[PDB]
Design a protein around this ligand. Structure first.
Ligand SMILES: Cc1cc2nc3c(=O)[nH]c(=O)nc-3n(C[C@H](O)[C@H](O)[C@H](O)COP(=O)(O)OP(=O)(O)OC[C@H]3O[C@@H](n4cnc5c(N)ncnc54)[C@H](O)[C@@H]3O)c2cc1C
Ligand SMILES: CN1CCC(Oc2ccc(OCc3ccccc3NC(=O)c3cc4sccc4n3C)cc2)CC1
Lengths: 666, 133
């Protein structure tokens, strides 16, 4: 859409309806009469539009009201509430902007933020934006976390996030305007190359893709129509359903052949029966000829019984010849009906070996996207975020994604090389205890009104703990952490002195000889300016390949590309890097996925902030002091940057509502 | 509420491939055999019918009799009557056959014959005798 309505859409909001959240803060309005609601909505959308139309400078309440024209211009509080509301929940005035109104002289409240991953940074900025004192602690010696980028000479390649999954309602679209990201479309053509080194024929490439896509809709049918969702008390995975669906197709091929050949016999037997009739008829004919022959040898003139005997035998004989000639006809038909049935046999197989290896690629690709074996994905829920897909094509960040977190860390109190070991929260406030990554002993203590945790899910799952909570986290949180999935997927970066591949083609596949090996180096990218080829390890492969020397892994790559591009066309690489995200202790994996047995709900559980018990018993209910953000907290945008930052903005709004109060809710 | 086209999935088979841990390969192996079973039994009847075909070689063409074409006639020769009565005796009511035999009398003429002559050729008696067979 375009107009004001397009601003709403672009801010992930229904242009013609009040959201649940807005209802919470404008309960007067939404319970109010219909007329007023349309006003509100317009104000919001218009205000949004304004922020969007230029996101490089702060949009103030004044500027906003200037551009309103009554009947909407009239009510100045409504405009103020609405503006301040959007301001609070990072719908406007987020990211990198110039600030019209310099900051509150002194700062209210203190927050410690664990992790300088985008979620963290986006919060930090937002809080400081509101005039709180913020300090982030990062175990790494660099911001971004899972926005890692590699730099050396003019070689540049992300090992972390790389892609913006459409700009249509993506808040990263706004950041793209505030920061120079060299955004390139991705040419979606990807040709596959069997084990030997040979492109798969266009003809097959399509047969299998279609079957792959067909098999997927199939699984969804099982789930949502046949309710095939539990097996022996345990919940069904995507992997299982796919096997079942596949088997069922194999089975249906057989059932068809059976029925066909079985239709052949039943006609073959009809022939047998007929021929018997035909042989016995010929036998009775044979003798009946002789009889007629003998009878006509009685030379005339003759008595009438002997004349009758000739005549009668003659007719009795033509009567049988008649019968036999009709059966010769009936036979003719059945001998052809077997030409037909021999000619059109149902398919020999469901899938050849070749077919199934290529199909395994398309599955690897799914294991790539979701960074986990299909064995582990919830059948019911793995694709729950598919409704909130952005529009527009996917783009890579050509200059390296690290440009974004860095940009956010301008003017922020970040303590790098500071690893949190324990978080203490009580009704009075919080102590965070970190150390120096370099010399573990050099110990730090931080006190604050609130902590915001952006620790990755893989870290939260770590046993025994890398971080202690004091008091421990309630079971409802820890159970959700157990149920959630935390996958893995690695990148190998190959740096060369010359482009020895088709520059016209951004990406191109390789087809592993096994099912158990489909993930290993199954996909290659050239998306960058320099001669850099990127190779992916996905699926069950990823976690195993983390126990192999880089040298070897680059070996296996080079081999592949020789086979594809010609043994002498493959120069050795000047520079190589291999990712190991599951190994990485500030990550312990790549990103969340909806494990079988979990739901989207767990994402909400993960976001729920934590409230300590009271200090003195029978003292009033304390405020909540421990907050959570990051990729695993946002139900509708999991495992992405936009989700991280959206969670970041979200928590910042929530914290501010707590510690600064929200005078826009009246 | 419908599978993608050419994908097959009914409630019952789903249950059937799942219940056991190998119920899949069991069922798929049963059919594998149950096929080769029918494939062989085709070979039987092929070869059986191949030998029956060999016995019929020659057709019936050596035993074919020429075509008689007598033009229907109203009169009954004394000869023709005699053939009738013997035919009645041998054939009963297959009036077609009786007409075929006499050579040149319509099947109606044959039927009337029973009525007009029944009187004198005891075609009653004659017919009981055929019945007794
Ligand atoms: C290989 C890969 C490819 C990806 N590709 C894409 C993509 O193409 N597109 C996309 O949109 N998204 C992608 N993502 C997802 C994206 O990287 C994440 O969603 C996002 O960076 C998560 O942000 P976060 O702030 O929640 O967590 P993080 O970015 O991990 O930040 C959390 C921070 O906490 C720090 N930390 C950990 N332990 C401690 C401790 N004890 N003390 C202090 N700090 C600690 C970490 O070092 C880290 O900096 C990808 C992820 C991976 C692994
Ligand atoms: C839970 N769910 C997982 C699927 C994610 O969506 C994807 C959509 C398309 C994908 O392939 C496009 C593509 C083509 C060519 C090169 C790279 C990519 N993509 C990525 O490397 C990629 C983009 C995103 S978004 C979150 C991670 C991720 N990855 C890893 C991949 C993932 C959304 C969150």
């Amino acid at each position: 859409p375009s107009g004001v309505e397009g601003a709403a859409f672009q801010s992930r909001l229904p242009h013609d309806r009040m959201t649940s959240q807005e209802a919470a803060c404008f309960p007067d309005i939404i319970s109010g009469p219909q007329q007023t609601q349309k006003v509100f909505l317009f104000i919001r959308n218009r205000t949004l539009q304004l922020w969007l139309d230029n996101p490089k400078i702060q949009l103030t309440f004044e500027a906003t009201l200037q551009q309103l024209e009554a009947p909407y211009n009239s009510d100045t509080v409504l405009v103020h509430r609405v503006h301040s509301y959007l301001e609070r929940h990072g719908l406007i005035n987020f990211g990198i902007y110039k600030r019209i109104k310099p900051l509150p002289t002194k700062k209210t409240g203190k927050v410690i933020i664990i992790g300088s991953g985008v979620s963290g940074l986006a919060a930090a900025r937002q809080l400081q934006s509101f005039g709180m004192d913020v300090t982030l602690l990062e175990a790494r010696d660099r911001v971004g976390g899972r926005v890692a980028t590699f730099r050396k000479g003019n070689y540049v390649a992300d090992l972390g996030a790389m892609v913006v999954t459409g700009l249509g309602g993506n808040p990263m679209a706004v950041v793209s305007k505030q920061v120079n990201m060299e955004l390139a479309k991705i040419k979606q053509k990807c040709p596959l190359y069997e084990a030997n080194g040979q492109a798969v024929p266009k003809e097959k490439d399509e047969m299998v893709e279609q079957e792959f896509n067909r098999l997927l809709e199939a699984t969804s049918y099982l789930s949502h129509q046949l309710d095939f969702n539990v097996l022996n008390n345990k919940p069904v995975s995507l992997g299982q359903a796919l096997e079942v669906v596949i088997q069922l197709q194999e089975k249906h091929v057989k059932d068809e052949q059976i029925e066909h050949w079985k239709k052949i016999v039943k006609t073959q037997e009809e022939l047998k029966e007929l021929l018997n009739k035909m042989v016995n008829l010929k036998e009775k004919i044979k003798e009946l000829h002789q009889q007629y022959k003998e009878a006509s040898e009685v030379k005339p003139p003759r008595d009438i019984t002997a004349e009758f005997l000739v005549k009668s035998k003659h007719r009795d004989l033509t009567a049988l010849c008649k019968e036999y000639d009709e059966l010769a006809e009936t036979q003719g038909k059945l001998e052809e009906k077997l030409q037909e049935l021999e000619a059109n046999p149902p398919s020999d197989v469901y899938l050849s070996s070749r077919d199934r290896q290529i199909l395994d690629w398309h599955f690897a690709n799914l294991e790539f996207a979701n960074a986990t074996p299909l064995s582990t994905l919830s059948l019911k829920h793995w694709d729950q975020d598919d409704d909130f897909e952005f529009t527009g094509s996917h783009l890579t960040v050509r200059n390296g994604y690290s440009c974004v977190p860095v940009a956010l860390a301008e003017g922020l109190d970040i303590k790098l090389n500071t690893a949190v070991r324990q978080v203490r929260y009580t009704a009075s406030g919080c102590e965070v205890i970190a150390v120096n990554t370099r010399s573990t002993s050099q110990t730090f203590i931080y006190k604050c009104d609130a902590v915001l945790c952006t620790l990755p899910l893989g870290v939260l799952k770590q046993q025994p703990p890398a971080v202690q909570f004091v008091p421990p986290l309630p079971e409802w949180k820890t159970s959700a952490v157990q149920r959630m999935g935390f996958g893995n997927l690695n990148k190998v970066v190959l740096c060369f002195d010359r482009v020895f591949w088709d520059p016209s083609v951004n990406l191109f596949g390789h087809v592993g000889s096994t099912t158990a090996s489909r993930g290993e180096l199954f996909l290659f990218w050239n998306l960058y300016k320099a001669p850099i080829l990127l190779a992916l390890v996905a699926g069950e492969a990823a976690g195993i390949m983390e126990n192999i020397s880089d040298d070897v892994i680059v070996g296996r790559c080079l081999a592949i590309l020789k086979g594809i591009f010609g043994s002498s066309a493959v120069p050795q690489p000047k520079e190589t890097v291999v990712s190991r995200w599951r190994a990485d202790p500030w990550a312990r994996g790549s990103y969340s996925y909806v494990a079988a047995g979990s739901s989207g709900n767990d994402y909400d559980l993960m976001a729920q902030p934590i409230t300590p018990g009271p200090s003195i018993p029978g003292a009033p209910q304390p405020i909540p002091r421990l907050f959570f953000a990051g990729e695993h907290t946002i139900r509708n945008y999991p495992a992405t940057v936009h989700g991280a930052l959206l969670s970041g903005l979200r928590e910042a709004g929530r914290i501010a509502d707590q510690f600064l109060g929200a005078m826009y809710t009246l | 509420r419908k599978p993608p086209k050419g994908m097959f999935l009914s409630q019952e088979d789903v249950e059937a491939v799942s219940a056991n841990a190998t119920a899949a390969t069991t069922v798929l192996r049963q059919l594998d055999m149950e096929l080769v079973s029918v494939k062989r039994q085709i070979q039987n009847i092929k070869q059986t019918n191949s030998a029956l075909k060999e016995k019929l070689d020659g057709g019936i063409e050596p035993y074919r009799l020429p075509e008689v074409i007598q033009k229907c006639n109203a009169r009954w020769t004394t000869e023709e009557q005699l053939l009738a009565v013997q035919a009645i005796r041998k054939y009963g009511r297959d009036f077609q056959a009786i007409s075929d035999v006499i050579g040149n009398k319509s099947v109606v003429q044959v039927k009337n014959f029973f009525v007009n002559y029944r009187r004198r050729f005891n075609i009653d008696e004659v017919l009981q005798e055929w019945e007794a067979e």
